[PDB]
From a paper:
In this study, we constructed the FtsEE163Q mutant, which was expected to abolish ATPase activity but retain ATP-binding ability. FtsEE163QX was successfully expressed and purified in the presence of ATP, while the sPG hydrolysis machinery complex FtsEE163QX-EnvC with ATP was further obtained by in vitro reconstitution. We then determined the cryo-EM structure of ATP-bound E. coli FtsEE163QX and ATP-bound FtsEE163QX-EnvC at overall resolutions of 3.05 Å and 3.11 Å, respectively, using the gold standard Fourier shell correlation based on the 0.143 criterion. For FtsEX cryo-EM map, we built a model including FtsE, FtsX (without the periplasmic domain). The FtsEX complex structure shows a severely disordered periplasmic structure, indicating that this domain is highly flexible. Notably, the cryo-EM map of the FtsX periplasmic domain in FtsEE163QX-EnvC is significantly clearer than that of FtsEE163QX. This suggests that the periplasmic domains of FtsX can be stabled when bound with EnvC, which helped in resolving the cryo-EM map of these regions. Our results revealed that a single FtsX molecule exhibits a topological structure comprising 4 transmembrane helices (TMs) named TM1-TM4. Between TM2 and TM3, there is a helix α3 corresponding to the coupling helix. The interaction between FtsE and FtsX primarily occur through the coupling helix, a fundamental component of ABC transporters that links the NBD and TMD to drive conformational changes in the TMD and other subunits upon ATP consumption.
FtsEX, an important component of the divisome, is mainly recognized for its involvement in activating the degradation of sPG through amidases via the periplasmic factor EnvC. FtsEX belongs to the Type VII ABC superfamily, which includes LolCDE and MacB. In contrast to the reported ABC transporters, FtsEX neither transports anything across the membrane nor extracts substances from the membrane but interacts with EnvC to form the sPG hydrolysis machinery to separate the daughter cells during cell division. The activation of AmiA and AmiB by EnvC is controlled by the cell division protein complex FtsEX, which induces conformational changes in EnvC through ATP hydrolysis.
Author numbering:
A (entry chain D): 334 to 379, 501 to 579, 596 to 633
B (entry chain C): 334 to 380, 502 to 579, 597 to 632
C (entry chain A), D (entry chain B): 1 to 216
The structure:
Amino acid sequence: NEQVRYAFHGALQDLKSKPFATFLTVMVIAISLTLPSVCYMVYKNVLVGRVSAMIGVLMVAAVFLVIGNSVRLSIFARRDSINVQKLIGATDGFILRPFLYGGALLGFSGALLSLILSEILVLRLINGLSFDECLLLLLVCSMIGWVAAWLATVQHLRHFTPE
Amino acid sequence: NEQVRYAFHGALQDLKSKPFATFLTVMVIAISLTLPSVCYMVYKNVNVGRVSAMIGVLMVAAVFLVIGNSVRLSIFARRDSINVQKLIGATDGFILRPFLYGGALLGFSGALLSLILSEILVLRLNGLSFDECLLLLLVCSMIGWVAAWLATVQHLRHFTP
Amino acid sequence: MIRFEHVSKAYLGGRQALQGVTFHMQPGEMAFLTGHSGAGKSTLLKLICGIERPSAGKIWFSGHDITRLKNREVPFLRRQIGMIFQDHHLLMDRTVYDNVAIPLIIAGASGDDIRRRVSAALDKVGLLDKAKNFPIQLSGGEQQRVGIARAVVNKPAVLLADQPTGNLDDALSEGILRLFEEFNRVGVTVLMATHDINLISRRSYRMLTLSDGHLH
Amino acid sequence: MIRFEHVSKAYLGGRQALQGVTFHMQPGEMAFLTGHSGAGKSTLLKLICGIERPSAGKIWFSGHDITRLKNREVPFLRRQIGMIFQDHHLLMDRTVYDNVAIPLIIAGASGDDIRRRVSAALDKVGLLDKAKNFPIQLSGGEQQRVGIARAVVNKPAVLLADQPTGNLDDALSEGILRLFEEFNRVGVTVLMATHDINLISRRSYRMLTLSDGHLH
Ligand SMILES: Nc1ncnc2c1ncn2[C@@H]1O[C@H](COP(=O)(O)OP(=O)(O)OP(=O)(O)O)[C@@H](O)[C@H]1O
Ligand SMILES: Nc1ncnc2c1ncn2[C@@H]1O[C@H](COP(=O)(O)OP(=O)(O)OP(=O)(O)O)[C@@H](O)[C@H]1O
């Protein structure tokens, strides 16, 4: 509880330090997420579906890789701070928590901006996503960011070891 | 002519140093480019007006963003070597060349990989022609070049008195 | 506390930094580690910290064999040691206060205690006015003193200094040595690797000389 | 060559590193720069190289006013100077040979000339057998000597060394000083900031003392 607030402030301090890099990172996630949402809603409002069942999996695969790539390159620029904390004598979990939260908020921010884009498209030219669908999308994107951050941080962790 | 080879060798060294990171960087650009490929294939074979124009711009807006962001972060990781080389007395053009060639190569590999993925889908279940393939490769290379130029130029204005 | 038994170290490539190093340092003892460039002093200090692993022999720290420590108990070893590095290994994105306070945050101290102890540690090395700056806005000697203050904040049992007086003039070097002696007067072990004879000639301590990875 | 007229330097925040420094150095002259930690030595050296811009006064390098240089002429100034840094500023992803040879490549020399000159320069600092290694595989003194070799490979008009003797013992410090004197014997200006009173005591050169940004 005491260390949770310290990690949470550590994640926002990084994101606020480079607003342009973060905003450009999030803007990619929103664009890559707004397409599946329009395609889902146009099909929901309205045998050819089986011919696109092998193509619907394609758009969802992009968002796994975009967020995973986005968090990976963020931790790489900070791979020096990982080494310093390991030298002082920090445990693996202590280093991990700042990075897990920053990835989760990165995916959450992109999904939140994705929903705003989808609504604007609807107003231009039918009903949009429901509250449950929006919450599910936000949760899934947050989990994707969390898993990607964990993978990247653990990969960089087993590098500064005595071996 | 004497510095083109040295710039080219440094571009490959940065990409080859981390094959796992570079390939994943390539892999995302390939996935994003596959969507316009199949959609253009279906529309070409089959053939609302205002129900796909806003979609069409949506995918093309992605490739600019995915390529630009990938080059943005790769240069940020190596921004220390820009400062060191600037202290010695290298000009802007000398520093810029290795980063420009890395940007063009990064898009070229991604566009070439998306061509293979689109070909697999046709084989799995008529498609793009040689001219369209060349056009897509050239467009992706041009986007990568511009992204690398922008990122490196913004990094050069930081390390100044 | 510290024991070396036929310690050898060879890096990946065949460059043997050490060859058959063996010695013993009782608790609270102070000593100097000297040698030429490339002798292998920083390798010895890192082998003490568990950053590197010896290729032969055994290393004992506080009576516990740390030759083959698992990755899970390494932080508990490194918490008792106050290590000063040669490149100062700072966090450039955090203030001087956060840099000096991170050992206490890892330890789990209270806010008032952290404030008091960080203020005292910064006051020892003459960097109390420089608590809000970032390491970029400091000098090389000031950054080295930031590293020193970070090292002496958590009350370690063993001090490992990796040339802590370079970038510091003779007055500051004498002050830092006096600070280390003050810490050694309360039972703390100190091992200071350096190659300035002017500082070490005026105090009679144990002498450890390294020549191509050989101990005398 | 080097001329200062009422130069001042104040950083962002109101910290004045220099105040009213004025001096002059004739071509081929050798001198020392000393002071306490935080005195303002590296700021002076950076002001010579054009890395920093003076807040007041004027600076002349080889008779050309460089107090307001355009960004298109900075490389042409910095190609004439061999600068040694306190952090050694190496490229960690390239070998020692590439690090030493990059000034020649920027200048535009041929392959065989690069081979010969870089081998000679690496032999001057005693690092010829380490030409293929990476800077991670080097000690602190060896990395400092790699920076020195990079500095003295392009036959400069001015040498700006900032404590190139820390991490080096007395014998290697003496050798580096003799190397600098060998370069000064052909008309190279040397201005060396140092913390070593013993090293400068046995040779009689010009002395420049700095205290809180003031020259004596
Ligand atoms: N990462 C590394 N990989 C391989 N060899 C290394 C590495 N770091 C240092 N060495 C080598 O190990 C030997 C000992 O280096 P070390 O830095 O421990 O010596 P040192 O005497 O403390 O140096 P200095 O006086 O310059 O600080 C030298 O041959 C050095 O070049
Ligand atoms: N980047 C910076 N921004 C602001 N102030 C700085 C910066 N770097 C140094 N200073 C300050 O400028 C003054 C002079 O520092 P400088 O490093 O030039 O002195 P120095 O005598 O060469 O130091 P040292 O002896 O420790 O190597 C000090 O007050 C220092 O803290």
